[PDB]
């Protein structure tokens, strides 16, 4: 009986492989061959943000494209004014071990998560004029790896317990749990429409999740090692993943397969973060070799490089209006590029 | 060029900078320790004088030590180990009494020692339950020489307790010495289930670690 189920599982995987192979007729590289290259992309560091006295793990741009929050090993959450370099708030954290931060789209909340296995939500705008913990979300048996607000009252998280969750912040309990991953879930990206999201895990697979149904619609597997980073194309019909296999791969939701891989023999370091430009033509990836590479997403030719960090780039963020790119690093500085 | 409200915001940012600098100065005093015992090691019990991630603080010679144990995570620790790449030292606890899992302890120690993130961090190895090891080897009902060929013929560098203890110590010390980099050192200590002085030995090894870092920064060694 067990062998029958194993055989069914194997044959269904083989059928899926054959179907995806049938859908493939021409490659994205072949189709984009007769298109003009982007050319050399030269970006300089317009601003450098100082005040974190330890390693930086996470950054997230606010929706106004001017405020950003960063999390560091020093145990502080700091909100920056990117235009003037001013510090708006400095939030002391109960646990110094942080691995992700998030900024609510409204701007009234930020979220922080780490090895304490709790996603903490902070009320930025409140009478008495100080930041306070509005809600501590307990229920995960592993470290919080990523969190992203959907609304003021909804946040989705990934964790080291190989599971993602959807929370109702006011109630404080999980309303949906997403259970298909074998390894720890490292990264998470919401779709622009918010109905769906993607996550990459240590099993070297990416999964597409229905926020309402609570099911895994699709699974993608091209990477040889763990996926540290994941980003959704601005269209919402594609996403890119980053791994310590040192490749970056682009996957399509509708075609259900990889479209291109962004690799070079010169680069052997792992990808810590990935992000897209507003058009999606540029795919920026942070690496463990202390540099970030600019990739031509449509031709998979490396257009440029951002090289200003003394230590590894932890986090990447392209601002909503597309003007600037933020990069946090283990050297304890965030740099804004343009 | 700068408005009144922008000037006030700049003053606020300067006050925040001052508070951050004061907090960092306060934090720099403490020395940070990572505790990693696989199982049945007495790692919660080794430092008993002072009492998702657990923390304990103890002070010896007016020096603050903060020790981290991560019980929340699953058995494999690979991903979150990059966080503790700045600690003064790691404290590895091993139960020398259990011979069957002793090779598992060796594999765990080798994995921690050869980690890319922890290349520059020393390890203070505590071999726990030496009294249980002594009782077992003195009884002689179970012998490591039977399972392990190496103890059957071993020259020491009771006497049977000595041979067993130095062989077990050499098992870890060989792994530590195999790299030969010299940037980080293993400090092995044989400890019983109850020991009055363990924080003293941690303090001495941390002092030596800081001394070696000083000698390396000064170009002397």
């Amino acid at each position, epitope marked *: 009986e067990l062998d029958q189920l194993r055989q069914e599982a194997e044959q269904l995987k083989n059928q899926i492989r054959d179907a995806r192979k049938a859908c493939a007729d021409a490659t994205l590289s072949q189709i984009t061959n007769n298109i003009d290259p982007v050319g050399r992309i030269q970006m300089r560091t317009r601003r450098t943000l100082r005040g974190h006295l330890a390693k930086i793990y996470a950054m997230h741009w606010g929706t106004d494209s*001017r*405020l950003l929050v960063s999390a560091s090993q020093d145990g502080k959450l700091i909100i920056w*004014d990117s235009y*003037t370099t*001013n510090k*708006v*708030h400095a939030i002391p954290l109960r646990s110094s071990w942080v691995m992700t931060c998030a900024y609510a789209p409204s*701007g009234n909340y930020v979220a922080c998560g780490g090895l304490d296995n709790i996603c903490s939500i902070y009320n930025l705008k409140t*009478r*008495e*004029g*100080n930041v306070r913990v509005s809600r501590e979300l307990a229920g995960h048996t592993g470290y919080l790896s990523c969190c992203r607000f959907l609304d003021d009252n909804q946040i989705v998280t990934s964790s080291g317990d190989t599971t993602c969750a959807l929370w109702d912040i006011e109630t404080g309990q999980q309303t949906t749990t997403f259970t298909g991953h074998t390894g720890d879930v490292m990264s998470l990206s919401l779709a622009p429409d918010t109905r769906l999201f993607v996550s990459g895990a240590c099993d070297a697979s990416a999964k597409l999740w229905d926020v309402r149904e609570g099911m895994c619609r699709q699974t993608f597997t091209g990477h040889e090692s763990d996926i540290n980073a994941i980003c959704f194309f601005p269209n919402g019909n594609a996403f890119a993943t980053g791994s310590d296999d040192a490749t970056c791969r682009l996957f399509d939701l509708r075609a259900d397969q990889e479209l291109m891989t962004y690799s070079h023999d010169n680069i052997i370091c792992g990808i810590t973060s990935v992000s897209f430009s507003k058009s999606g033509r540029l795919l920026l990836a942070g690496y463990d070799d202390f540099n970030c590479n600019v990739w031509d997403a449509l031709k998979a030719d490396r257009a440029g490089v951002l090289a200003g960090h003394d230590n590894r780039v932890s986090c990447l963020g392209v601002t909503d209006d597309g003007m600037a790119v933020a990069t946090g690093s283990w050297d304890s500085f965030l740099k804004i590029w343009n | *060029t700068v*408005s*009144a*409200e*922008d*000037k*006030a*915001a700049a*003053e*606020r940012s*300067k*006050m925040i900078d001052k508070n951050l600098r004061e907090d960092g100065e306060k934090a720099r005093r403490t020395l940070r320790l990572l505790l990693l015992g696989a199982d049945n090691s007495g790692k919660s019990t080794i430092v008993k004088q002072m009492r998702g991630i657990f923390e304990t603080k103890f002070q010896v010679d007016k020096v603050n030590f903060h020790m981290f144990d991560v019980g929340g995570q699953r058995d494999e620790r690979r991903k979150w180990i990059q966080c503790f790449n700045d600690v003064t030292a790691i404290i590895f606890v091993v139960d020398s009494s259990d011979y069957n899992r002793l090779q598992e302890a060796l594999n765990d120690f080798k994995s921690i020692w050869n980690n890319r993130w922890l290349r520059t961090i020393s390890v203070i190895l505590f071999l726990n339950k030496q009294d249980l090891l002594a009782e077992k080897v003195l009884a002689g009902k179970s012998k490591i020489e039977d399972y392990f060929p190496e103890f059957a013929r071993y020259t020491t560098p009771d006497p049977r307790v000595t041979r067993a203890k130095y062989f077990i110590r050499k098992e870890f010390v060989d792994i530590s010495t195999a790299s030969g980099d010299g940037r980080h050192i293993c400090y092995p200590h044989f400890t019983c289930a109850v020991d009055t002085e363990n924080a003293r030995r941690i303090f001495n090894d941390c002092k030596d670690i800081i001394l070696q870092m000083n000698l390396r920064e000064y170009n002397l060694v």
Partner: single-chain antibody
Amino acid sequence: VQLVESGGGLVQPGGSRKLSCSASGFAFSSFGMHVRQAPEKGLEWVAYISSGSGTIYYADTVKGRFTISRDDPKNTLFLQMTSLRSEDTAMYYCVRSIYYYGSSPFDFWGQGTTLTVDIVMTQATSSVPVTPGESVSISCRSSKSLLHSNGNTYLYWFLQRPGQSPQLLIYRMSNLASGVPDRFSGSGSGTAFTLTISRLEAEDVGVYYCMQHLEYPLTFGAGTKLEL
């Protein structure tokens, strides 16, 4: 959140008196503090003390005679006055303010204490006839442009209902203050600002003041009153 002012009363001319404003229910250290109203006049800004006391400004009228201070552990704010003149008589108000990106200065005011002993901001109408349920527009004008290169126009609106201290409605010409209904709306251009109240109700009656925070000294309009 609460500010209570103590000290005041009759003082002979040339005397000295100290006012005290005690803060309760908010992080007093993080807020910068500031205002007086003569017995039948509009608002006049007196002094400012920054958070941490790094900055102090005074009105030129009171400079050399008024000293402003704060006791952060006790959360108290004070104003030591000397050489008191008959023109000093007023009701002195204690006002909290905080300055970061997106903040709302002058949001809370105290009840005030009564003592008895430059950009020109223009409010043409001293009074405006109004009936309930009808939209009304109140205008203010500035000698120079309150528009700044950063893109902010530092204009504020306050409402002082009868028998009450002022209350912030609009900050930076367009941003509605917290706890204020959507009826109030602020629109304007550089040097020309209007406050439109739509679907007017009772308890909207009072004196509407326009204030600029572009540069110190902070200056007020004369104030336009709404009377049913």
